[PDB]
Write a protein that binds this DNA or RNA. Structure first.
Lengths: 96, 114, 79, 98, 127, 206
RNA sequence: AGAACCUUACCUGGUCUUGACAUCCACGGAAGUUUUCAGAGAUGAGAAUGUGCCUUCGGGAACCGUGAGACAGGUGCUGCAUGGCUGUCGUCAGCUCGUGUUGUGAAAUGUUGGGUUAAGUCCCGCAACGAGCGCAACCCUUAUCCUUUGUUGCCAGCGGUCCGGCCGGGAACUCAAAGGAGACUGCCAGUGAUAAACUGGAGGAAGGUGGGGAUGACGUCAAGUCAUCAUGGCCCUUACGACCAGGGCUACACACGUGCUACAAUGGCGCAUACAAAGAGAAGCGACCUCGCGAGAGCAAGCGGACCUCAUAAAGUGCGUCGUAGUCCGGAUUGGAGUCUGCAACUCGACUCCAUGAAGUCGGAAUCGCUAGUAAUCGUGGAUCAGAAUGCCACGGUGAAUACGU
């Protein structure tokens, strides 16, 4: 299969999906530094395997750090082998 | 460059570039900008001709960037080349604004220099 | 302990200290760190750091684990 | 006199867009006549979920949407100052049709 | 009657006035000599306007927010040709057949998502 | 191999899809994972089922999976107990009562999967293949489907060299979208290497 | 398609060796979480808060810590085994067949000729007739108008103008789309075997595919790809397996390929000035407000985006300037002050101000790209972004000649 082995980035930017959309407006004081939270803001050091800063273009097919788009998560270089699938809005090969 | 200035920054707003005159610095910038009477509130559409109308007044009435620096640092020792330590202190690189001579604060040496 | 939790060291000393700890010794390192800390495994040895003036010794002992190099290496000398 | 070609996108958005699209268009003075019972209707893009050999199934996306019947005649200045300044109802399209 | 009209080129949004008299011309708070006389835009921004009624003869209180210099020229042309319909209600055919309301090809072609110029090799000819 | 998969090109045509829908922008990962899990885990144990086609669709938070079987004898099994077990397994994996449907199919002549499987089995049987190729072509032509193409890989006997043959006969307009062409390649691990068989069928027009 | 550790497949050093990856087995029990000691982490010694549910109460569904085995796996070797994909001739006009005909026969014709010519597209003539693949159109955008239609967008006309068209309101209509027509040798005349085709003209916004794309055949090179994946064969599983911690792909003694910067006055300075679109974004831009010459920070509405931000446009013109000054050009380059991204960034973050004013003043041998919006440019942003473009993608602003000729 190999899908699970190369799914390192799948579980890195998934938990926090809705952890700030409805919290930033209400907790803007905590979210925004009132300067310096040298201790509270450094708590991200403890998780060394999943964090917002660890985003690496999730690709379960090959696990490489390339090939992602937050808008739809569609191919940008694999299009060469999947140009007929119709998954190329906005970004397409530049020959025309 | 300016009317009598240098150091043009590329593709920047009015306050960002017009205030590149060498006179403004760390502590003396406030007086120069107060004399100019300009702020960032004016946008490209709201930019007004007062800046050019007051550029000549500010350069003339107030001390020019060049002669100001020359009198502050050079003119004190250019004519008085005696053993007075006041002139040598500025060029020696020792703290003049809180900059230790060697450890990470080699400021007054001029050009970038290890 | 500037981080207030989970102390970590800069890459300055770790350029070669992690190898010299069990590989013997290496040539002097052009290290500019001023916030690194010493470890008890390197008692009697100092990491050559070019803080800006010159090489500065750093004495360490077993009881010192989180002490910083800058604290034990007085380098700044005004006038 | 007012027909709407509603573009359905999803269920989460429509759940609030069924009413919140024009809920802010009437405070005290607007001429909106309020919600209509609006029995079940299927309005969406001219796209089918999966057209197959069976031409009678005509599978289509099922979304509960409500067409706008504002029909204002004399809104007050304050009543419609925020006619479109809505914080909710992701999907909004007031496509009036004479 | 007051001959008003917007017109555009490249998604412009102008406010074109045409009424008898009103010698003063306010083209988006500009000056007549700054956009129509004795300067870079003396005539290039009015080349099609030469064929149609002269600009100086008809007041233009235009707040044209859109288009390049030639884009502004085409927007003004479109606005005037679509605004003087009240002056000549039959122009809907005449100007239509005179090639004055048509969106002139003298513009950057409307494109899908494509190359730098969408018609030639961009400035990276190296392959 | 500059060719392209006809099924992928047929995404915008009434032919059945594999993965396409419109939904919220914050639920792509979980939905894709669920679709991959159900697709992968709904065919591995169907080796003896010989199911003609299983399609999973998720238009908008709804599953309408369709199953078409080829041979009733080989799929009924022990009074359909295996079918019920598979339905329960997929339902518990998805967590919802999937509306499973079974549609009977027959005439194992114009089905690309069945003919490809038969060709692979005959090749594995240690018998001649060109005769089987011609027989399949003529059988397909006899029952309609005016147009068909076949192709086989090499690796014959104890020879490392490989050759490719088509023996095409009829109309196979791959370039034109309006051709309702069907194709499903198969592979067989013979004594020496793996032999791949590709079949294209042009079963009339819309 | 974005390299501080991680990245990264390498080397070094510490560490684990049924694991750090996935299934099964034996032991009991949930775990997760908080604190420690040593450690650079790896882990080793741990301790607790613990202890959700099933439990015909095993002990499992799950995970916790250890152990033997079937093990897994390796960006380790073979594209000179392959599947698939790509570059190559090549958007080149091509490759074949059925029947018929000519020849004892191999074979030829079809597909050799004329024009369109981009052309096995098309037509004509023709022992050839037709057909199967390629091309064209059938696909998307754009050149005009129309059916349907106005929310935020335009504000024709009506009320003042909350002079920006803000509110209703008209959806005439700019803009927008659910569907179409309009270019199709359609026509006048001539050249041309009358034919085809061409030419001169007219019709219309659009004359001889109106302007661009998606569409790459038989093949093709042992082409490359086992390092994207899968994959036959070649090793071994206390391991040429791996976790962790530094570096390296950017290091130099030079050369090459690409682009950018310029070498300026067709430009530079500050002043006034109207100058875009496609896009992107509830883990986001960040409106506005205050400072920082600035970086960006303290405060902050807005939006689920025809509604809130990037976003003001630039080369340009009139205003004074130097009249070619190694220059206010150019910006590398060697420090400081500093802001932010990030636990942490000399090797390997970005950005701003002062200093830096070097080579280079249009570049030899020569060589390459260019067919109308062409070159030539000016920037704008988007994807890649923890972050780090002169790369790449996408948008506009303007805008010529050369194509006589084989």
């Amino acid at each position: 299969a190999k899908q699970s082995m190369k799914a390192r980035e799948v579980k890195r930017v998934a938990l926090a999906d809705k952890y700030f959309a409805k919290r930033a407006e209400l907790k803007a004081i905590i979210s925004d530094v009132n300067a310096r939270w040298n201790a509270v803001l450094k708590l991200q050091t403890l998780p060394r395997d999943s964090s917002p800063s660890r985003q690496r273009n999730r690709c379960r097919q090959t696990g490489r750090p390339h090939g992602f788009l937050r808008k739809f998560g569609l191919s940008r270089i694999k299009v060469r082998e999947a140009a007929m699938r119709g998954e190329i809005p906005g970004l397409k090969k530049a020959s025309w | 460059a300016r009317i009598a200035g240098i150091n043009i920054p590329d593709h920047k707003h009015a306050v960002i570039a017009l205030t590149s005159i060498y006179g403004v610095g760390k502590t003396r910038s406030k007086a120069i900008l107060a004399a100019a009477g300009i702020a960032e509130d004016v946008k490209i559409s709201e930019l007004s001709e007062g800046q050019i109308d007051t550029l000549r007044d500010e350069v003339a009435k107030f001390v020019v960037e060049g002669d100001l620096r020359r009198e502050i640092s050079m003119s004190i020792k250019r004519l008085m080349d005696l053993g007075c330590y006041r002139g040598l202190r500025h060029r020696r690189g020792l703290p003049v604004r809180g900059q230790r001579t060697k450890t990470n604060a080699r400021t007054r040496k001029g050009p970038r220099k290890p | 302990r500037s981080l207030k939790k989970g102390p970590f060291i800069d890459l300055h000393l770790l350029k070669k200290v992690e190898k010299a700890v069990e590989s013997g010794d290496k040539k002097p390192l052009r290290t500019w760190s001023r916030r690194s800390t010493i470890f008890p495994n390197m008692i009697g040895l100092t990491i050559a750091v070019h803080n800006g003036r010159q090489h500065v010794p750093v004495f360490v002992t077993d009881e010192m684990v989180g002490h910083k190099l800058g604290e034990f290496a007085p380098t700044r000398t005004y006038r | 006199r007012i027909r709407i070609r509603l573009k359905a996108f999803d269920h989460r958005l429509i759940d609030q867009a069924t009413a919140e699209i024009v809920e802010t268009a009437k405070r005290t003075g607007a001429q909106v006549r309020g919600p209509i019972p609006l029995p079940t209707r299927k309005e969406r893009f001219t796209v089918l979920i999966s057209p197959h050999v069976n031409k009678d199934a005509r599978d289509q996306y099922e979304i509960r949407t409500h067409l706008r019947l504002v029909d204002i005649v004399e809104p007050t200045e304050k009543t419609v100052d925020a006619l479109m300044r809505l914080d909710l109802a992701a999907g909004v399209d007031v496509q009036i049709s004479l | 009657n007051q001959y008003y009209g917007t017109g555009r080129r490249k998604s412009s949004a102008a406010r074109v006035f045409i009424k008898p008299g009103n010698g003063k011309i306010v083209i988006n708070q500009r000056s007549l000599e700054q956009y129509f006389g004795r300067e870079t835009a003396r005539m290039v921004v009015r080349q099609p306007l030469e064929l149609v009624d002269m600009v100086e003869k008809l007041d233009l209180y235009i707040t044209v927010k859109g288009g390049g210099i030639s884009g502004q020229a085409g927007a003004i042309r479109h606005g005037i040709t679509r605004a003087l319909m009240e002056y000549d209600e039959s122009l809907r055919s005449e100007l239509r057949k005179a090639g004055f309301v048509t969106r002139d090809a003298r513009q950057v072609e409307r494109k899908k998502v494509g190359l730098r110029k969408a018609r030639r090799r961009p400035q990276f000819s190296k392959r | 191999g500059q060719k392209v998969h006809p099924n992928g090109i047929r995404l915008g045509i009434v032919k059945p899809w594999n993965s396409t829908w419109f939904a919220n922008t914050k639920e792509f990962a979980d939905n894709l994972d669920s679709d991959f899990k159900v697709r992968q885990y709904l065919t591995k144990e169907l080796a003896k089922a010989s199911v003609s086609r299983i399609v999973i669709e998720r238009p908008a938070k709804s599953i309408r999976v369709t199953i078409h079987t080829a041979r009733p004898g080989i799929v009924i099994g022990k009074k359909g107990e295996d079918v019920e077990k598979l339905r329960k397994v997929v339902a518990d994996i998805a967590g919802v009562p999937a509306q499973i449907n079974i549609a009977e199919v027959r005439k194992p002549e114009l089905d690309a999967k069945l003919v490809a499987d038969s060709i692979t089995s005959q090749l594995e049987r240690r018998v001649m293949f060109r005769r089987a190729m011609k027989r399949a072509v003529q059988n397909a032509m006899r029952l309609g489907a005016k147009g068909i193409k076949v192709e086989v890989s090499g690796r014959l006997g104890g020879a490392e060299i490989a050759r490719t043959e088509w023996y095409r006969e009829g109309r196979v307009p791959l370039h034109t979208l309006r051709a309702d062409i069907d194709y499903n390649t198969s592979e067989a691990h013979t004594t020496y290497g793996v032999i791949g068989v590709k079949v294209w069928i042009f079963k009339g027009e819309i």
